[PDB]
Paper text:
To compete in certain low-light environments, some cyanobacteria express a paralog of the light-harvesting phycobiliprotein, allophycocyanin (AP), that strongly absorbs far-red light (FRL). The FRL-AP expressed during LoLiP is composed of an α-subunit, ApcD4, and a β-subunit, ApcB3, each of which binds a single PCB. Despite binding the same phycocyanobilin (PCB) chromophore as conventional AP (λmax = 650 nm) and the PBS terminal emitter, AP-B (λmax = 670 nm), the absorbance maximum of the FRL-absorbing AP expressed during LoLiP is bathochromically shifted by ~40 to 60 nm to ~710 nm. Instead, FRL-AP is membrane-associated and copurifies after detergent solubilization with IsiX, which suggests the existence of a unique antenna complex specialized for harvesting FRL.
Using cryo–electron microscopy and time-resolved absorption spectroscopy, we reveal the structure-function relationship of this FRL-absorbing AP complex (FRL-AP) that is expressed during acclimation to low light and that likely associates with chlorophyll a–containing photosystem I. FRL-AP assembles as helical nanotubes rather than typical toroids due to alterations of the domain geometry within each subunit. Each (αβ) protomer binds two PCBs (one per subunit), one anion tentatively modeled as Cl− and 110 water molecules. Each repeating helical unit of FRL-AP comprises seven protomers that span 720° over 72.6 Å. Consequently, the α- and β-subunits of FRL-AP form an angle of ~135° in the xy plane, whereas the corresponding angle in the structures of other AP-family representatives is ~120°, and there is a slight separation along the z axis, ~10° (bottom left). Superimposing the individual α- and β-subunits of FRL-AP onto the corresponding subunits from other AP-family representatives (i.e., AP and AP-B) reveals that the XY domain of each subunit is positioned differently in FRL-AP, which is the cause of the more open configuration that results in helix formation. In the β-subunit, helix X and the XY loop are substantially shifted, ~21°.
Residue numbers in the entry:
A (entry chain A), B (entry chain C), C (entry chain E): 27 to 184
D (entry chain D), E (entry chain B), F (entry chain F): 1 to 160
Amino acid sequence: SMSIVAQVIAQSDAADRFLSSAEIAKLEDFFSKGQVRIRAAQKLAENEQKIVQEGSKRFWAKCPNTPSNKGNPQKTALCQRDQGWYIRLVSYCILAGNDKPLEDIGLNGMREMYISLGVPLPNLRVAMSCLKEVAAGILSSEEMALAAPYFDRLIRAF
Amino acid sequence: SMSIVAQVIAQSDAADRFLSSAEIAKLEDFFSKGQVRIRAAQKLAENEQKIVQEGSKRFWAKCPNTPSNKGNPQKTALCQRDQGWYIRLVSYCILAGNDKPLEDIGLNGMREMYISLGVPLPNLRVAMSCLKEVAAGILSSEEMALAAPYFDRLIRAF
Amino acid sequence: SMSIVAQVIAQSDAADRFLSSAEIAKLEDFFSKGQVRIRAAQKLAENEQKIVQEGSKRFWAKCPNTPSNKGNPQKTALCQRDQGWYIRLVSYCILAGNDKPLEDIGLNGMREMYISLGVPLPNLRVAMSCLKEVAAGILSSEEMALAAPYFDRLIRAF
Amino acid sequence: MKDTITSLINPADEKGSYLDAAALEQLNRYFQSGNMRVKAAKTISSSASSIISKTVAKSLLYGDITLPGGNMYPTRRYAACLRDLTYFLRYATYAMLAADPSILDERVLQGLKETYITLGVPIDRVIQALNAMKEVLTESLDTEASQEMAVYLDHIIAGL
Amino acid sequence: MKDTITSLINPADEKGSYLDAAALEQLNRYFQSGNMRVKAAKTISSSASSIISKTVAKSLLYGDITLPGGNMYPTRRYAACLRDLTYFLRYATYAMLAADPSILDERVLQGLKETYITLGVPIDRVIQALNAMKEVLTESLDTEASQEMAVYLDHIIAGL
Amino acid sequence: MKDTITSLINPADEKGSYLDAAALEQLNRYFQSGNMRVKAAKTISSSASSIISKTVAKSLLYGDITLPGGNMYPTRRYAACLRDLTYFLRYATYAMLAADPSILDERVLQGLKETYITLGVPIDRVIQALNAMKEVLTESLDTEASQEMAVYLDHIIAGL
Ligand SMILES: *[C@H](C)[C@H]1/C(=C/c2[nH]c(/C=C3N=C(/C=C4\NC(=O)C(CC)=C4C)C(C)=C\3CCC(=O)O)c(CCC(=O)O)c2C)NC(=O)[C@@H]1C
Ligand SMILES: *[C@H](C)[C@H]1/C(=C/c2[nH]c(/C=C3N=C(/C=C4\NC(=O)C(CC)=C4C)C(C)=C\3CCC(=O)O)c(CCC(=O)O)c2C)NC(=O)[C@@H]1C
Ligand SMILES: *[C@H](C)[C@H]1/C(=C/c2[nH]c(/C=C3N=C(/C=C4\NC(=O)C(CC)=C4C)C(C)=C\3CCC(=O)O)c(CCC(=O)O)c2C)NC(=O)[C@@H]1C
Ligand SMILES: *[C@H](C)[C@H]1/C(=C/c2[nH]c(/C=C3N=C(/C=C4\NC(=O)C(CC)=C4C)C(C)=C\3CCC(=O)O)c(CCC(=O)O)c2C)NC(=O)[C@@H]1C
Ligand SMILES: *[C@H](C)[C@H]1/C(=C/c2[nH]c(/C=C3N=C(/C=C4\NC(=O)C(CC)=C4C)C(C)=C\3CCC(=O)O)c(CCC(=O)O)c2C)NC(=O)[C@@H]1C
Ligand SMILES: *[C@H](C)[C@H]1/C(=C/c2[nH]c(/C=C3N=C(/C=C4\NC(=O)C(CC)=C4C)C(C)=C\3CCC(=O)O)c(CCC(=O)O)c2C)NC(=O)[C@@H]1C
Ligand SMILES: [Cl-]
Ligand SMILES: [Cl-]
Ligand SMILES: [Cl-]
């Protein structure tokens, strides 16, 4: 029950009834712009790395006091890795129609992991804000209208 | 455990004891008027069809908006069939001393069947009321004193 | 596992361990006064009949409304038989070191047997009380200190 | 367990027909058995302990079966025999009131002979106690009530 | 239950990669199935009782199965058949909307054949009613919607 | 398992008689065995591990049976031998306290010889360890207590 269709079917099956008009309304809004979802996920996959370095530059301008900006390249590589991983989790949510790929994979237990690692949370605030701004410059006006709830959801978890 | 004697024996056997005075009182009232029960079941069998057409006429007078009164004779025949079947289930209850032939055969799942068939339930209200009135005119004063709890039970299930 | 030694061994064997100090304490108290047990069982065997008639006289004085005191000598003989049987079951418990010869032979299903026979239970109350008082007059101070738990156990079962 | 009324009403329901004249006729004579079967079941249900006491007192007592070595010694074996005879009387009364020995076969007479042979219970003494139970019931019930209880106790005897 | 979107998103998450071009391509054609599957699920969810009524009225009624001795006699057996066909329609609609017959296998077709053989339910009549359900859905849905419901009802038929 | 008291009380109950003078006499000399059997069972129950350690240390150790190829190699086979000797000591103590070797036959010596022959366990070494167990018990118990434990260990030896 990760995707929106499976959740709709699981809510209807639990109540031993057919698909109510609210659930038809939810699946109408998911499947009407499903070409945009394929296009947005393909675009986020296609130029992941361009987004990641162009957001890392803006993030190191807006926050130079990071564990990434400490000289050694391997914490920097782990930060670039995390930026790409969170863009992948945003693309999964664009495809799934709900933020449950971002909650189950990305945000469940994220705070405990980052506080133990020593990565500050305002640093991740501004990192995912810069990543959102770069991806807004990349995607479109209306593919970003799909992605921006999930980028906002990711940003708000820090 | 359809008949009253078998239910009495099943209640006494479950409690590992002999027949209590309430159960002797119930079997006294069943077996005292058991000649009337044989006579009533034989009479309901004997002129089933007279009751069914004479009640169908009164029912089509009191309710002309039936699936039976739609011209084609085969829904009409299925209605006459059901009237005879429910008179047979009433006679089984007269013989058994309880309404368990009517519940197990006739009323369990009856509403789902008739709502799926498209037969209205006020139509069956008035059909079994007219069938009761005709059978009251047929049986006696006191054979009908046996049948009228079961006809009322059948009527109340619609 | 009727005797106390067999029960001690069965409790130790079930727990896959040797003899605990509680069980050594129980077998110390059983075997220290085991000469008294042989003497008491031999004395109860030796003058059974003296106890039985001398207790029957006191019991017919204290309760004349018995099935024994109804003239015919054969219910009287069955009562004398039962008094001797229960003295034998007391002697088995003196030898065994526990009241399990009295429970398994004498008291298991005793109440159902005596209620079906028509022998009243206060009659047996007072019969075994008089039998205890006579055997206290017979045995000793300290052989009766062994028998009196088992006579009390027999008395309390009525 | 199937009684007389259900064993006629059920095949009429499988056929979807009324009770035909043969089955309704054999039901009618059951319905005028009727009040006497209920009268016998009332007499037995109040005086069941007395019936069992008289049954034991004229077939099993005052002999070697209640003495040591017998199978009604000690009190536990006596109590087991007493509740066995109470089972036999209660299920014969059920089968008499139902006019059908089917409750005697799926509640009483199933593995009972093998149980008694394994246990060492003397089946001839059980049969002799059931024969005395018939004589006890003859002196306490009405005339044809005793005969029907005799039929339903002979079914237990023949099963044993 | 796994649907089409989860069955592609989950292996990409185990791999830690994006949806590659084959899986994203087969997801894309599911996304332009899409609005018609939702339109068919809307049509079925409002008119489910009518679909079941028409399915029974052209495959099961007016014969010997609803007469005494049949397996749709008495009313309890009719009601059981009716809710069975409603289960079949609802889970076929779920499997059509999901584009995946996995919900038909772990909710419907598991022990069902053995249940029907033990119960005495005529499986050929069930299959014939499902064949009539396909014809009822053909006259009420759109063209390829009927074909996809036919696929997901044939999965129940082949499991039965 | 039947001990000495039950093996006398039970036939008196089957006969329905008291304990006659022969059985009550042979019970009396068991009752003045008595406190010494309990004293020996107390000594063994506290020092059982020490008894088994001394039994192994003078019959089984410092040879080729605990070296590779021996049947007390590796540690699993040593532990199995150790709990076997603990079984032998515990059931001999039970049979001594009961004054009856019946618990040695239905708990210990039943299929044991065939078990050891199938397993390859050297029965002569087991018998030699039981012979050393008797010498260990002789140095730790009283005089006739050691003799009765010797009888009940010879019963295991003769069964093996
Ligand atoms: C970069 C935007 C920010 C930051 C990053 C940083 N991250 C790490 C180390 C790790 N990061 C993760 C991340 C995840 N595990 C998951 O399951 C998910 C969701 C799918 C994520 C995002 C993990 C597991 C590690 C541990 C190392 C490893 O992967 O083996 C570090 C290194 C910290 C350290 O002590 O080594 C850093 C520096 N740093 C910044 O400045 C940015 C705010
Ligand atoms: C007449 C009083 C009313 C009514 C009747 C009507 N009935 C039917 C069709 C069917 N009726 C049944 C009935 C029963 N099945 C049972 O097990 C029992 C209890 C023993 C009963 C009463 C069934 C199974 C059917 C289906 C057809 C068949 O038997 O094969 C119809 C036809 C409806 C249709 O769509 O064909 C009708 C019209 N109609 C009235 O107007 C009266 C209120
Ligand atoms: C005398 C103290 C009391 C009493 C006695 C009485 N007893 C009986 C008849 C029977 N008593 C027994 C007793 C036992 N069976 C056992 O297994 C044991 C324990 C080992 C006991 C004590 C039995 C079996 C009978 C049945 C007859 C028989 O043995 O064959 C009676 C006769 C009752 C009757 O209806 O015949 C009587 C009168 N009566 C008293 O007044 C005293 C209280
Ligand atoms: C008295 C008639 C004779 C007798 C009886 C006796 N029976 C048993 C033990 C058992 N009796 C039954 C019988 C039934 N159990 C049921 O549920 C029913 C039907 C409702 C019946 C008929 C069974 C199954 C047993 C074995 C299990 C148990 O004991 O409960 C005993 C006891 C045997 C024993 O060793 O204790 C006895 C003594 N024996 C006679 O000598 C009388 C002639
Ligand atoms: C109508 C199509 C045919 C028919 C049907 C019939 N079925 C049953 C009883 C049962 N049906 C099921 C099936 C399911 N239960 C579920 O939860 C699901 C999936 C969601 C399915 C598919 C089961 C398990 C049973 C047995 C338990 C129960 O009765 O509830 C019956 C009743 C049988 C009876 O003896 O009462 C019937 C009549 N029979 C026909 O003849 C029609 C062709
Ligand atoms: C030491 C004395 C000698 C020896 C012992 C040895 N025994 C076994 C394995 C088994 N021992 C038993 C014996 C018993 N189990 C019981 O419950 C009881 C009574 C309470 C007894 C007496 C059994 C049944 C087995 C087989 C099952 C099992 O292993 O548990 C072994 C192990 C053999 C193996 O291959 O592992 C050994 C080594 N062997 C010697 O050489 C010593 C002289
Ligand atoms: Cl019992
Ligand atoms: Cl149902
Ligand atoms: Cl081991």
